[PDB]
Amino acid sequence: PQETLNGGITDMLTELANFEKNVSQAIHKYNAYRKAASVIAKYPHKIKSGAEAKKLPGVGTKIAEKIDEFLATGKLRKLEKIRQDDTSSSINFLTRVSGIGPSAARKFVDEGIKTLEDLRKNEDKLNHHQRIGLKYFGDFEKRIPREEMLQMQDIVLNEVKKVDSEYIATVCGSFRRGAESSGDMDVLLTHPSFTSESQPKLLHQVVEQLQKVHFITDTLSKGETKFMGVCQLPSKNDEKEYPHRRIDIRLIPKDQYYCGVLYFTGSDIFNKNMRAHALEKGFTINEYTIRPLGVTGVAGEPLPVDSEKDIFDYIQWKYREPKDRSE
DNA sequence: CCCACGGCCCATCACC
DNA sequence: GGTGATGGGC
DNA sequence: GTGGG
Ligand SMILES: Nc1ccn([C@H]2C[C@H](O)[C@@H](COP(=O)(O)NP(=O)(O)OP(=O)(O)O)O2)c(=O)n1
Ligand SMILES: [Mg+2]
Ligand SMILES: [Mg+2]
Ligand code: NA
Ligand code: NA
Numbered sequence: 001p002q003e004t005l006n007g008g009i010t011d012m013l014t015e016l017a018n019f020e021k022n023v024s025q026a027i028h029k030y031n032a033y034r035k036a037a038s039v040i041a042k043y044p045h046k047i048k049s050g051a052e053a054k055k056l057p058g059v060g061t062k063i064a065e066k067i068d069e070f071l072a073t074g075k076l077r078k079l080e081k082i083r084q085d086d087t088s089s090s091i092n093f094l095t096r097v098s099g100i101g102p103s104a105a106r107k108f109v110d111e112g113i114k115t116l117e118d119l120r121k122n123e124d125k126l127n128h129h130q131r132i133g134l135k136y137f138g139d140f141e142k143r144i145p146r147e148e149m150l151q152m153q154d155i156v157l158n159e160v161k162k163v164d165s166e167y168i169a170t171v172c173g174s175f176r177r178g179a180e181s182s183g184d185m186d187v188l189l190t191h192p193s194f195t196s197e198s199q200p201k202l203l204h205q206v207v208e209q210l211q212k213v214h215f216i217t218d219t220l221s222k223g224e225t226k227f228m229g230v231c232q233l234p235s236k237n238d239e240k241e242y243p244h245r246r247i248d249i250r251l252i253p254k255d256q257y258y259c260g261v262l263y264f265t266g267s268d269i270f271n272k273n274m275r276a277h278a279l280e281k282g283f284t285i286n287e288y289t290i291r292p293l294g295v296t297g298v299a300g301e302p303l304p305v306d307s308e309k310d311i312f313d314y315i316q317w318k319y320r321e322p323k324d325r326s327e
Numbered sequence: 328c329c330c331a332c333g334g335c336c337c338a339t340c341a342c343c
Numbered sequence: 344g345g346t347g348a349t350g351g352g353c
Numbered sequence: 354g355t356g357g358g
Binding site: 098099100101102103104129184186220221228248264268 | 349
């Protein structure tokens with residue numbers, strides 16, 4: 001559906017969702033509003049009343065009332081008021097800095113720190129991640145055109161094979177679903193010597209090499225299985241520099257890999273829909289495995305999975321191209 | 328009336 | 344020094 | 354906030 005169908009309503013709900021997460025610290029209300037926004041966004045008609053909306057699953061009494069007020073006035077008094085509130089709107093804004101959550105934003109605003117400028121003035125109170133988030137605030141809210149993702153993929157797959165030609169690397173996420181732009185880059189990594197029944201160097205080696213060729217520029221977090229950091233394409237000398245980008249690299253056991261690829265190729269909406277169907281034939285699927293639910297819900301042993309397809313087979317669904325896993 | 332609300336790794340805090 | 348809890352991200 | 358035991 002076109003966004004201008006009910007965009008006014010969904011904008012309202014998303015903004016409400018944001019204030020619940022960031023200011024009220026009510027995560028389940030945040031998800032409630034999002035779910036409501038999502039189901040309304042998929043609704044193929046212009047909503048004329050809150051009662052009409054209430055028919056949709058996830059839209060209840062309170063949101064129905066909010067829709068009525070919005071339809072009658074073009075606004076929400078509560079939303080209008082919290083927008084004007086310096087404290088609440090500053091708290092809500094600072095959470096856009098990667099590394100600053102509802103709690104940190106709260107503490108900052110409590111002690112007079114409300115803007116990016118104030119953050120820049122008080123580096124002493126920021127942790128490593130927050131400093132990076134601050135330094136690349138602008139860049140991190142930029143999307144990544146597919147053409148750059150391709151170039152980023154070229155570098156990653158090249159350098160990974162250079163380190164060890166037995167590595168397997170896959171760019172997942174919205175890129176693998178064929179999106180024409182992405183928020184970040186997700187890389188899944190495996191190696192024939194790393195399975196469930198098993199360096200910590202395997203992830204480190206790759207990260208280090210990507211640093212050596214000046215692709216990776218910063219590190220947010222780095223463990224033995226998960227890396228989160230910043231990367232940047234090289235410039236053309238004449239041409240102006242590319243924005244810095246967020247990149248995640250996950251090292252996964254060889255025998256948990258194609259569950260990982262499925263999960264982290266995702267679409268959140270597809271994952272939960274494929275979750276949904278999986279439990280209905282008595283299967284539970286997470287990022288690691290697919291397990292048969294038992295006569296009680298006895299989730300037993302992981303089944304063998306050597307491809308994305310096997311997982312589709314288990315729950316009698318035909319293989320869906322990542323291109324179509326929007327939902 | 329009352330509880331659940333897809334999950335987990337890493338950095339850092341709280342506390343012994 | 345350490346273990347467990349919490350914040351944050353995705 | 355919504356849904357359901
Ligand atoms: N908590 C999480 C985090 C990620 N995922 C899955 C679904 C996502 O499509 C996939 C990758 O996560 P993601 O990077 O945050 N989203 P994605 O790459 O699809 O789109 P972008 O907004 O980054 O362009 O992992 C998930 O199912 N639950
Ligand atoms: Mg992504
Ligand atoms: Mg990601
Ligand atoms: Na409803
Ligand atoms: Na943030």
